[PDB]
Every structure is written in C-alpha cells, then in structure tokens.
Amino acid sequence: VAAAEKT
Amino acid sequence: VAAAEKT
Amino acid sequence: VAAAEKT
Amino acid sequence: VAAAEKT
Amino acid sequence: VAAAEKT
Amino acid sequence: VAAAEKT
Amino acid sequence: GVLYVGSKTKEGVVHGVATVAEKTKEQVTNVGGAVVTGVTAVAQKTVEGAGSIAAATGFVKKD
Amino acid sequence: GVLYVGSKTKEGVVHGVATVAEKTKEQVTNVGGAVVTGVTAVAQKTVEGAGSIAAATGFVKKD
Amino acid sequence: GVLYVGSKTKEGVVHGVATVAEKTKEQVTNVGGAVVTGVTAVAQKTVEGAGSIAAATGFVKKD
Amino acid sequence: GVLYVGSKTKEGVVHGVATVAEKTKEQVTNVGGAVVTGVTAVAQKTVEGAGSIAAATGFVKKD
Amino acid sequence: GVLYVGSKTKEGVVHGVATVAEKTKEQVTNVGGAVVTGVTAVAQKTVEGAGSIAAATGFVKKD
Amino acid sequence: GVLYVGSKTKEGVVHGVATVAEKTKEQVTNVGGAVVTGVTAVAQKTVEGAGSIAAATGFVKKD
Amino acid sequence: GVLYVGSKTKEGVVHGVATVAEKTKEQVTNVGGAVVTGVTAVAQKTVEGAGSIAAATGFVKKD
Amino acid sequence: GVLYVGSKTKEGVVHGVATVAEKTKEQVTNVGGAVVTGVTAVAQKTVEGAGSIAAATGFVKKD
Amino acid sequence: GVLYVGSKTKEGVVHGVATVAEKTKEQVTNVGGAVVTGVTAVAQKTVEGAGSIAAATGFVKKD
Amino acid sequence: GVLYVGSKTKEGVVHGVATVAEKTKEQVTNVGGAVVTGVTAVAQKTVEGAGSIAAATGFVKKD
Amino acid sequence: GVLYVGSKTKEGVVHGVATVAEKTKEQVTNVGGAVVTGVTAVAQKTVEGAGSIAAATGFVKKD
Amino acid sequence: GVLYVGSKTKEGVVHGVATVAEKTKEQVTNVGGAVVTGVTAVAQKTVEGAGSIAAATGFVKKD
Amino acid sequence: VAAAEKT
Amino acid sequence: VAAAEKT
Amino acid sequence: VAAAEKT
Amino acid sequence: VAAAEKT
Amino acid sequence: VAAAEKT
Amino acid sequence: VAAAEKT
C-alpha cells in the first residue's frame, strides 16, 4: 500500500 | 495497491 | 491495483 | 504502508 | 508504517 | 512506525 | 606457422560517441510499474547466460 | 610456432564518450515501483551467469 | 614457441569519458519503491555469478 | 618457450574520466524505499560470486 | 622457459578521475528507508564472495 | 626458468583522483532509516567473504 | 513603464558542445609560414575594433 | 507601457553541436604559406570593425 | 519605472563543453614560422581595440 | 524606480568544461619560430586595449 | 530608488573545469625560438592596456 | 536610496578547477630561447598597464 | 621563393 | 626563401 | 631563409 | 636563417 | 642562425 | 647562433 498526494 | 493523485 | 488521477 | 502528502 | 507530510 | 512532518 | 583461435576479436564494444541533450523539463511519473530512461553508451558481453539491457517488467505475479 | 587462444580480444569495452546534458528541471515521482535513469558509459562482462544493465521490475508478488 | 591462453584481453573496461551536467533543479520523490539515478562510467567483471548494474526492484513480496 | 595463462589482462578498469555537475538544487525525498544516486567512476571484479553496482530493492517482505 | 599464470593483470582499478560538483543546495529527506549518494572513484575485488557497491534495501521484514 | 603465479597484479587500486565540491548548503534529515553520503576514493579487496561499499539497509525486522 | 536598451541580449555565446577526436597520428610540418589547427568552442565579442579568430598570415614583407 | 530597443536578441550564437572525427592519419605540410584547419563551433560578434573567421593569406608583399 | 541599458547581457560566454581527444601520436615540426594548436573553450571580450584568438603570423619583415 | 547601466552582465566567462586528452606521444620541435599548444578554458576581458589569446609570430625583423 | 553602474557584472571568469591528461611521453625541443604549452583555466581582466595570454614571439630583431 | 558604482563585480576569478596529469616522461630541451609550460589556474587583474600570462619571447636583439 | 620536393 | 625536401 | 630536409 | 635537417 | 640536427 | 645536435 502506498499513497502520494500533492495538494 | 498504489495511489498518486495530484490536485 | 493502481490509480493516478490528475485534477 | 507509506504516505507522503505535500500540502 | 511511514508518513512524511509537508504542509 | 515513523513520522516526519514539516509545518 | 601460427594458430589463432578466438583471437583479435572485438565483441561488445562502443567507442566514439558524442551526445548532447538540451531538455528544458523532464518529468517521470511512475505508479506500480517500471520505467527505464536514457541508457546510453553501454557495452556488454556474456558467456553462458541471458543478458539484458534496459529491459523492464511492470510486475511479476505468481500467486 | 605460436598459439593464441582467446587472446588479444576486446570484450565489453567503452571509450571516447563525451556527453553534455543541460536540463533546467528534472522530476521523478515514483509510487510503489522502479525507475532507472541516466545509466551512461557502462561496460560489463560476465562468465557463467546472467548479466543485466538498467533492468527494472516494478514488483514481484508470490503469495 | 609461445602459447597465449586468455591473455592480453581487455574485459569490462571504460576509459576517456568526459561529462557535463547543468541541471537547475533535480527532484526525486520515492514512495515504497526503488529509484536509481546517474550511474556513470561504471565497469564490472564477474566469473561464475550473475552481475547487475543499476538494477531496480520496487518490492519483493512472498508471504 | 613461454606460456601465458590469464595474463596481461585488464578486467574491470576505469580511467581518464572528467566530470562536471552544476546543479542549483538537488532534492531527494524517500519514504519506505531505496534511492541510489550519483554512482560515478566505479570498477569491480568478482570471482565465484554475484556482483551488483547501484542495485536497489524497495523492500523485501516474507511474512 | 617462463610460465605466467594469473600475472601482470589489472583487476578492479580506477585511476585518473577528475570531478567537480557545484551544488547550491542539496537536501536528503529519508523516512524508514535507505538512500545512497555520491559514491565516487570506488574500486573493489572479491574472491569467493558476493560484492556490492552502492546497494540499497529499504527494509527487510520477515516476521 | 621462472614461474609467476598470481604475481605483479593490481587488485583493488585507486590512484590519481582530484575532486572539488562547492556546496552552499547540505542538509540530511534521516528518520528511522539509513543514509550514506560522499563515499570517495575507496579501494578494497576481500578473499573468502562478501564485500560491501556504501551499502544501506533501512531496517531489518525478524520478530 | 520599463525601457530596455541593448538588454537581455546574447552576443557571442557558445554552449552545449560535445566533441570527440580519435586520431591515430597527427603531423604538422611548417616551414616559414603559419598553421592554425583545432580551434574549438571559441566565443568572442569586440566593440570599436576588428576581431579575428583562427586567422593566419604566412608572412608580411614590406622592405 | 514598455519599450524594447535592440533587446532580447540572439546575435552570433551556437549551441547543441555534437561532432565526432575519427581520422587514422592527418598530415599538414606547409611551405611559405598559411593553413587553417578544424575551426569548429565558433561564434563572434563585432561592432565598428571587420570580422574574420578562419581567414588565410599566404603572404603579403609590398616592397 | 525601470531602465535597463546594456544590462542582463551575455557577451563572450562559453559553457557546457565536453571534449575528448585520443591521439596516439602528435608531432609538430616548426621552422621559422608560427604554429597554433588545440585552442579550446576560449571566451573573450574587448572594448576599444582589436581582438584576436589563435592568430598566427609567420614573420614580419620591414627592413 | 531603478536604473541599471552596464549591470548584471556576463562578459568573457567560461564555465562547466570537461576535457580529456589521452595522447601516447607528443613531440614539439621548434627552430627559430613560435609554437603555441593546448590553450584550454581561457576567459579574458580588456578595455581600451588590444587583446590576444594564443597568438604567435615567428619573428619580427626591422633592420 | 537604486542606481547600478557597472555593477553585478562578471568579467573574465572561469569556474567548474575538470581536465585529465594522460600522456605517456611529452618532448619539447626549442632552438632559438618560443614555445608555449598547456595554458589551462586562465582568467584575466585589463583596463587601459593590452592583454595577452599564451602569446609567443620567436625573436625580435631591430639592428 | 542606494548607489552602486563598479560594485559587486567579479573581475579575474578562477574557482572549482580539478586537474590530473599522468605523464610517464616529460623532457624539455631549450637552447637560446624561451619555453613556458603548465601554467594552470591563474587569475589576474591590471589597471593602467599591459598584462601578460605565459608570454614568451625567444630573444630581443637591438645592436 | 618556395620549394617542396618529395623524392 | 623556403625549402622542405623529403628524400 | 628556412630549410627542413630529411635525408 | 634556420635549418632542421634529419640525416 | 639556428640548426637542430637529429641523426 | 645556436645548435642542438642529437646523435
């Protein structure tokens, strides 16, 4: 599981 | 599982 | 499973 | 599990 | 488990 | 477990 | 009399390569796969085994 | 009389490489995978085994 | 009489490499994977074993 | 009479490398993986064993 | 008569490397993984064992 | 007559390296992992054992 | 309001040049004259005067 | 309002040139004259004066 | 308001040049003249005067 | 308001030059003249005067 | 308000030069003349006077 | 308000130079003339006077 | 005057 | 005057 | 006057 | 006057 | 006057 | 006057 949001 | 959103 | 949305 | 948000 | 937020 | 926030 | 066996060969050689790459902006975005870029001026020899340059496999699943 | 076996060879050789790269902005974003960049002027030999340069595999799953 | 076996060879050699890299901004972001960058002027030899340069695997899962 | 076996070889050699890198800003961000950068002017030989340069594995999980 | 076995070789050698790196700002941020940077002018030989340069593994988990 | 075995070799040698590094600001931040920087002009030989230069492992968990 | 006079110009600029010259044998023989060779990657500006690059005059005689 | 006079120009610029010259044997023989060779990637600007690149004159005689 | 006169210019600039010269044998023989070789990566500006790079005059005679 | 006169310029600048020269044998033979070799990475500015780089004159005779 | 005259300029600057020269044999033989070799990474400014780099004159005769 | 005259300039500067010179044999033989060799990493400024680097004159004769 | 014989 | 013989 | 003979 | 013989 | 014999 | 014999 991986996540990488740019906001 | 992977995710990578740019918002 | 992979996802890659640009918004 | 990893996470890396830029806000 | 890892986390790395820049805000 | 690791955490590394820049605020 | 002289015998040459497998001799004076060149096998897997690169020479005399000039390269210029002006690129204002490069972006790689990779999710869950493999990406290979820019492999330049590479030379290889194998004996008795498989040999790969810049090969990519997105994933291997064998459940 | 002279015998040469496997001799005077060049095997896996790189020479005389000039490279310039002006790049104002490089970005790599990698999630859960593999990225390989910029592999330049590489030389290899193997004997009795597989040889890989710039190979990438995104994941191996064998549950 | 002279015998040469496996002699005077060049095997896995790099020489005479000039490189310039002007890059105003480099960013690598890696989550949960492998990233390899910039491998330059590398030479290897192996005997009786697999040899890898700049190889990347994102993960290996064998639960 | 002379015998040469495995002699006068060059095996895994690098010489004569000039490199310049002007980079105004480098950033590496790594979460939970492996990053390898800048590997320059490297030479190796192995015998009877696997040999890796700049190899990266993001993780190994075997629960 | 003369016998040379395994003699006069060069094996794993680096010489004549010039390098310049102007970098206004370097940042590494590492969380829970491995980062390798800047490995320069490295030479190695092994016999009867695996040899690694600049290898990185993010973690090994075997619960 | 003369016998040379394993003799006059160079094995794992570095010489003639010039390096300059102008860096206005270096920062390393490491949480819970491994970071390796700046490994320069290193030479090694091993016999009968594995040899690692600049290897990094983020952690090893075997509960 | 803004005025730019003679501004933001590029005037006599060279950048991003890669050149390789493998030449097994160069000979110059000069008797009583001028020889110019190899002028590479040269940039000049003059103001209020004649400008010459790689100019050759074999002799000037004004008895 | 903005006025640009003579601004943002490029005047005498060269960029992005890659050149390779393999020449087994070069010979120059000069007797009593001028020879110019190899002028590569040259850029110039002049103001208020004559500009010459790679000009050659064998002799000037004005007795 | 802002005025720029002669400002932000580049005038006589060279950057990002990689050059390699493998030459097994160079010979210069000069009798009674001028020889110029190898002028590389040169940048100049003059004001109010003649400017010359790699200029050769075999002789000046004014008896 | 701001005034820039002759400001923020670059005038006679060289940066980021990598050069390699492998030359097995150099010979210069000079009799009664001038020889100039190898001028590399040179930058100059002059004001109110003539400026020369790598200029050669074989002789000046004014009896 | 701000005035800049002749300010923030770069005038005659060299930076970031890497050079390697492997030369098995150099010979200079000079009889009665001038020889200039190897001028590398030189920067100059003059004001109100002529400026010369690597200039050579074989002789000046004015009897 | 601020006035800058001739300020914040760089004028005749060299920095960040790496040089390596492997030369098995250097010979200079000079009879009756001038020889200049090896001038490296030199910076100069003059005001109100002629400035010379690596200038050679074989002789001056004025009987 | 100039001359250049190869013999 | 110049001369350059190869013999 | 200049000369350059090979003999 | 200059000379450069090979003999 | 100059001479430079190689023999 | 100069001379430079190699023999």
Residue numbers in the entry:
A (entry chain j), B (entry chain g), C (entry chain e), D (entry chain l), E (entry chain n), F (entry chain p), ...: 16 to 22
G (entry chain E), H (entry chain G), I (entry chain J), J (entry chain L), K (entry chain N), L (entry chain P), ...: 36 to 98
Can I see the authors' text?
Amyloid fibers of the protein α‐synuclein (αSyn) constitute the major content of pathological intraneuronal inclusions, Lewy bodies, found in dopaminergic neurons in PD patient brains. Amyloids are polymers of monomeric protein units non‐covalently assembled through β‐strands arranged perpendicularly to the fibril long axis, forming a cross‐β structure. We report that αSyn amyloids display catalytic activity toward ATP hydrolysis in vitro. First, WT αSyn type 1A amyloids bind and hydrolyze ATP in a specific lysine‐rich cavity positioned between the two protofilaments.
To investigate the interaction between WT αSyn and ATP at a molecular level, we turned to cryo‐EM and solved the structure of WT αSyn amyloids in the presence of ATP to a resolution of 3.08 Å. The high‐resolution structure of WT αSyn amyloids in the presence of 1 mm ATP also shows a type 1A‐fold, as expected since the ATP was added after fibril formation. Interestingly, however, there is an extra density corresponding to the N‐terminus forming a β‐strand involving residues 16‐21. Furthermore, there is an additional density for ATP in the cavity between the two protofilaments. The diffuse density rather indicates that ATP binds in several similar binding poses dynamically. The cavity in which ATP is found contains several lysine residues: Lys43, Lys45, Lys60, as well as Lys21 and Lys23 (predicting its position based on the partially resolved residue 22) in the additionally ordered β‐strand. The additional β‐strand in the N‐terminus of one protofilament interacts, in the same vertical layer of the dimeric amyloid structure, with the ordered core of the other protofilament, resulting in a peptide loop enclosing the protofilament interface cavity and adding a β‐sheet to the overall cross‐β structure. The following plausible mechanism of catalytic action emerges: With an induced fit mechanism, ATP binding to type 1A αSyn amyloids (anchoring at K43 and K45) recruits an additional β‐strand comprising residues 16‐22.
